[PDB]
Design an enzyme around this catalytic site. Sequence first.
Site: not given
Ligand SMILES: Cc1ncc(C[n+]2csc(CCOP(=O)(O)OP(=O)(O)O)c2C)c(N)n1
Ligand SMILES: [Mg+2]
Lengths: 559, 558, 558
Positions: B424, B478, B547
């Site tokens: 992320f 979230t 979602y």
């Molecule tokens: C460095 C890291 N830590 C934890 C994760 C687990 N993870 C993957 S995507 C993400 C973010 C998800 O939230 P968001 O960007 O808001 O996308 P959403 O699922 O809400 O659409 C996380 C915590 C990750 N991908 N990378």
């Molecule tokens: Mg989100």
Amino acid sequence: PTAAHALLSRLRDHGVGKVFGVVGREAASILFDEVEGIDFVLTRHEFTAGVAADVLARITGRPQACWATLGPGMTNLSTGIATSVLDRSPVIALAAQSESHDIFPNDTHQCLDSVAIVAPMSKYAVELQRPHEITDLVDSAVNAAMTEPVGPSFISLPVDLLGSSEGIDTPNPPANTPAKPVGVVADGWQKAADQAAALLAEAKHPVLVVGAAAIRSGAVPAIRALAERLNIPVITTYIAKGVLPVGHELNYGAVTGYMDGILNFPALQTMFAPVDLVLTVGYDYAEDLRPSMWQKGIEKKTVRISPTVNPIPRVYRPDVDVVTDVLAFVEHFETATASFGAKQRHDIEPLRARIAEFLADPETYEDGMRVHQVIDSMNTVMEEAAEPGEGTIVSDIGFFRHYGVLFARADQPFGFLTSAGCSSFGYGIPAAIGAQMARPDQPTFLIAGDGGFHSNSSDLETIARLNLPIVTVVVNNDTNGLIELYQNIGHHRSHDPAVKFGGVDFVALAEANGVDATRATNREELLAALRKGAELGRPFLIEVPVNYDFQPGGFGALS
Amino acid sequence: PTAAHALLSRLRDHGVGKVFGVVGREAASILFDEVEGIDFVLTRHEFTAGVAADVLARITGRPQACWATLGPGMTNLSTGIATSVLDRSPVIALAAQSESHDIFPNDTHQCLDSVAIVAPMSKYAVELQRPHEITDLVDSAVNAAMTEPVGPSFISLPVDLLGSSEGIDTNPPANTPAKPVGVVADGWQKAADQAAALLAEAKHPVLVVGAAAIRSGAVPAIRALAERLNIPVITTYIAKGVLPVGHELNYGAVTGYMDGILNFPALQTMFAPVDLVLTVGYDYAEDLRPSMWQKGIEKKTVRISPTVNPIPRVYRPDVDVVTDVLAFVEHFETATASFGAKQRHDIEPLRARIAEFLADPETYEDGMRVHQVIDSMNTVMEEAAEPGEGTIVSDIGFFRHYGVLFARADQPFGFLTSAGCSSFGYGIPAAIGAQMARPDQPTFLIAGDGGFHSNSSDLETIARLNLPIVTVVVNNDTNGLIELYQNIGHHRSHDPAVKFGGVDFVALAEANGVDATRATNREELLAALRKGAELGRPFLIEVPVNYDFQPGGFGALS
Amino acid sequence: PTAAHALLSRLRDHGVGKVFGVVGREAASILFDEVEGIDFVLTRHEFTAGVAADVLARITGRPQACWATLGPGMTNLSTGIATSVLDRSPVIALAAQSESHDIFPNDTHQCLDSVAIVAPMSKYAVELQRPHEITDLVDSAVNAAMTEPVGPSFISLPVDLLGSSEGIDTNPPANTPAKPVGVVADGWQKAADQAAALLAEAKHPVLVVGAAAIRSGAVPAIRALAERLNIPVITTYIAKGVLPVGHELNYGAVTGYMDGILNFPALQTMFAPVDLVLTVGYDYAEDLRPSMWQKGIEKKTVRISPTVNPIPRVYRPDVDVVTDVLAFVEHFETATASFGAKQRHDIEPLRARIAEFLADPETYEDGMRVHQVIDSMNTVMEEAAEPGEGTIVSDIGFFRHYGVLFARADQPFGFLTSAGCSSFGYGIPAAIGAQMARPDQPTFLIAGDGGFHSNSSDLETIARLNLPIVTVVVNNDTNGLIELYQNIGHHRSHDPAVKFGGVDFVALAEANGVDATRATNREELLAALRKGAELGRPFLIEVPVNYDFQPGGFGALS
Ligand SMILES: Cc1ncc(C[n+]2csc(CCOP(=O)(O)OP(=O)(O)O)c2C)c(N)n1
Ligand SMILES: [Mg+2]
Ligand SMILES: Cc1ncc(C[n+]2csc(CCOP(=O)(O)OP(=O)(O)O)c2C)c(N)n1
Ligand SMILES: Cc1ncc(C[n+]2csc(CCOP(=O)(O)OP(=O)(O)O)c2C)c(N)n1
Ligand SMILES: [Mg+2]
Ligand SMILES: [Mg+2]
């Protein structure tokens, strides 16, 4: 009833009530509601989780825990793990891993060789293989974390095994967490301590140089009693500030290699020149009070006291080396020196006058404020807001940090909190989080420079969410100022593409994150903003424009 | 004239014009003005520097460089290094180290055993020991980086040796590989002919194309092969755009999340009647896994890769062709010159389902749906970009798999995300690298609130460099992907592990000097995207989303 | 005046008078005459050098040194290093390395990544980089080797740097620890007191003593405790002799093989009625495992060790005392000063059985039995040796466990074998080390044909040094232990995996300049041993033996 349950349950057996982290897809195997009395503290970045855990472990003296997902989760956590290994704190770092049958590092999606990556920077590092063994792995992790030099232990957790109940049955053995850090003890340390006593007997101007391992040993009251009976000055590393109260006649202050250059004053010489005996009590080279800093003026003898064998004989060859528990050394020394009378302590009033002059600086500058004026304002409001012997000033990393080391009030051990061994920028917010949780009713102030604060500013939202009433002061010069200093030390000029930023409005940044904030450009506005923040019952941020005006030629002690 | 000069000068010989990073106290030994033609690009965090280098390397096909200080600098950079090792890009990662006479890992201030930490996630990792050898170390790092599977090489640089001129006399040719060096098996030609014989027998073959085919320079050749023999092309996440949007053989990208998002038997539509899968430039890290195409009838497989198969436990192709992808395709063209075109299978029900998501005219009480957001982004990107140009970048999260399915890609790497590492916060650095690689093309970034905010401070870097990136932050307060997984595993959520409070990304962007606005429906979003595309400055748009996921439809993930 | 001189001079400062090894092309940089007081001891193989240093260090309690050339020198030495790491011995292992500017592991001739290879089996591993630092590296090596668990430290020495005088001027005190630095947990006195309370309530406690107890200097104190409170003493293999032969509290040594060998419930007899097991100086590596004492009634356990328990999966002591062993015994004397003596449990049926094996008067149709061989060695050892003196060394094999049960030991380390690592071939180097450490005492060695021949060439070394070791080779033309395991696992043998042809060890010894003889019965063996012991020169006795083992008797080996 799964390995996730047995993991959380064993953490709780070792006293853990919080797990800091960011959870990834391993949430399919672990919710974090499986065990009563242990809660998850979600951060914006894994670095923040690791540092919060480190600092809560520093102040409590007990193991804490942080969590990240596989692959990049774990690499992000690793700066937190590096903080703990170099700053010395007992942290259990946990990270998910690919399903066990599918671990092909650098080939499986998000699969890295976590144990191999983290083992060079940890006390212990292992991958879970059979679900029921998580109990004994947590134990061995705590054992290694709680042995000096204290540090982080790592467990990699394949998602399938984390979610498995195979071999897990309904009565855990005793946790047996060490009461304080385990250390090493040389045969003949008592004799070595008696030799240190015989050097003290002859010495005209001895000093005690106290590091954090002395605090971990629980040796602060005993050290103070020793120092007061014998009239021996106490000098500290950055994070051993406050082992004596503000205003104590033997509180000779902390040392930083930057002090001569910041003060334009012969401070190291004043501090050390007439000293003939240096007792480094709980010495640790990582804290960065190095031998070259006290090797000033007359020839000195040295005594090292540490619960570790000397790892750096190339740099520090003590005349006497006492490898034992710090508290045991001090108690043995009290007995050996019971008959001794008090020394004449050496005079450092010229240095104290210079420091006080910096703190009282009434001038108005056309640019912004000066950092010493900022810290003086924080001291004043911290003294008003905290009970006696309470409160924490936290410092991120930067040039301003060494003003913190010289100028910040510390009225208890770890009353001034910064990262001495690792010194990652962005340390400030997670350290303030850990400090405020460890000391729930004490005022917690953070000072951070613009460079480092913005490296990790997103966790302002975490502060808002947990409603931790931290007051933050951002000293902003649109620069990685420490680095501009080094550019000029090395080459006698700057190069802006490597150190300069554009404008960030930290007041508005904070408010985007749900943290009330304001700007302050002089003493009067800063005092009012600090007093408002301290009584707010909520987090608060204060942006202060500053400049430094540094003298590149004055920092030869850094070499 | 020091090792700092010899290092930068040697990066320059290998075509490097930028070093991304954060400089620490090694600034006393390196200024970054020592060599004309190489500029330093200062970021807010070393991760951003690593990823920007990775993405620039991917698009240029040339080695790029990033920089960190000792200790926590290097470990911050390491997530960038991890990105480059799993996503496969030739990055030279450089980090300072304690003075050579003072290296005591975990004892000296800021001193970690950098080489031991980085070796397991790199092609090459070494510590400088004698100043003049920095030239040959950079050469050996480029060499290992530009060998498939391509990846980062690391050099640790003691501050004293970096600032030293000992043994440096005042240069041999660089010989930078134009494309990655590959592994080639004896008898690959024979294996390629067995693959041709399977193609002859197959009624419904498909080409499943990965990024390694792009690196090899095989896009036009694959397309001419596919067009002549009427063979559908299916891609990984970042091989989107190897065919133009609208090409009839463009059968879409695959993701494991596609059935659950579409609420449709998409994998079975894509793969059920297929009897031969040719994985061209296959790489398991991209996460198009064998289990995803093993739908319906039994299939034969041909693996083509410039590497030996590292995962025989998971993937045992019927024919394994280890060679350069372009070499395979040119040989295969000859072996199949006389074959008749195939009757390709039907995926129109999947195409209609995807189109129906994109055209979703509903107003929800919540916020927007992510497929509506991306539809609006596709519309404006097509208006603003020349044909065959433009980049949509995606950060990581649940929304990212919507990007795979729905985002427009009209050239190779026209849709950029991190497939192997998936850290992320990837979005901002990837958009920086993308925009610098394609300075006259529109660059749009979609990111979620979770990942965006993990690395949002480099919004200041975008303002400072004045890169006209348009960012859309889709916000549901979230870590949405993770709440999904909570529900897949336990049929409920636990908020303390996934839920945030409110962040005002509009105001966050403006604090950093980036104009921004809020958009809550298609009309507002289209206008904001058009304002941003023509602004000539970075712009940010926050969009509320939700979602409403169905946990039971995501069985392909296990 | 070179880093070679500085290295040897600093070893000499730490009390070292011998360096065991094989010298390679680094002889151009070091002669081994640079420093008076240190002699080189050339062996035929580097393993012998490492083990000899290991055993010399165990008996003297002082750090010792071994030496090998680069590449295969170092890998050969590493079995010696493994011996030292598992058996717990303070050895400084030194190996040359390619010239510093030419270190390319697996590419330069004879160049291996020595530090990476040795680091996982050592206390400390480093490569010399600046000549004058060899002094501090030796000190750090000693520091780490003399910290519990004691073990070897490794320094790799590039031949150019070894031979360089750059930065060496013409010296700080060494400060060698007299006994090992130990781990000590806060509150160990409270844990000790909790152990005293367990002792008070216990009807039949036992002291199980390992080698760490001997390193601590705790033998006299342990003896005094046991005699005052009438507590039986049981030992690991090399802790035999902490009580004199004949002492009423000498309950013997434990091996997991003892039931099968004695065809008797020996472990049941030893431990069934015991209610408190104090493992004094416990170390799992010695291979007295908890499952061995977990017989009959429920027991409480006290662990005493100058280390934190590394194996909680296997051993969870009711009370864990992490402190120096002698310090524990002295605090335990105080807390139990007023306690009444215990009633010791009865093991006469086990003593009777052991004595029956030793007196076995039959002459067997095939070879001698190993218990008869050892009885003979015991008889002659007692004649030849002053009281409290002499060493019997055992190599590794089935016969070694007869050594454990049957061999006389009238002092600490009077019976030596490798308990942790148990490399075959151990015998010769261990006897060299033992004889050099005890120059006026008889040293007998027993080895099997398999293990003896694995390292038999160092017979020449024994002859060249004129060490008066009497060796007994028990020969069954088999790796006998392994045939045992074939039968335990599958209830049959497979000869290609275990059977040898004939080796005439008498003729082999005489080829190396060692007088020898064959003995096939008690009379011949006694005569050969008595001759050997008075010869004033090394002697070798070959004895044909057989085992006739019973596979079903060995279920304790789990
Ligand atoms: C460095 C890291 N830590 C934890 C994760 C687990 N993870 C993957 S995507 C993400 C973010 C998800 O939230 P968001 O960007 O808001 O996308 P959403 O699922 O809400 O659409 C996380 C915590 C990750 N991908 N990378
Ligand atoms: Mg989100
Ligand atoms: C992870 C990491 N990268 C780089 C550095 C080098 N560094 C130390 S502090 C710092 C920030 C200095 O700027 P700022 O926080 O604004 O304080 P200032 O020096 O301006 O007073 C940097 C870049 C670091 N400490 N940590
Ligand atoms: C280096 C090494 N390789 C293999 C083994 C397995 N092993 C242990 S002892 C031994 C020798 C057994 O034969 P021998 O010395 O004749 O004694 P015996 O069992 O016949 O009594 C072997 C092969 C070992 N211990 N060490
Ligand atoms: Mg600044
Ligand atoms: Mg045999």
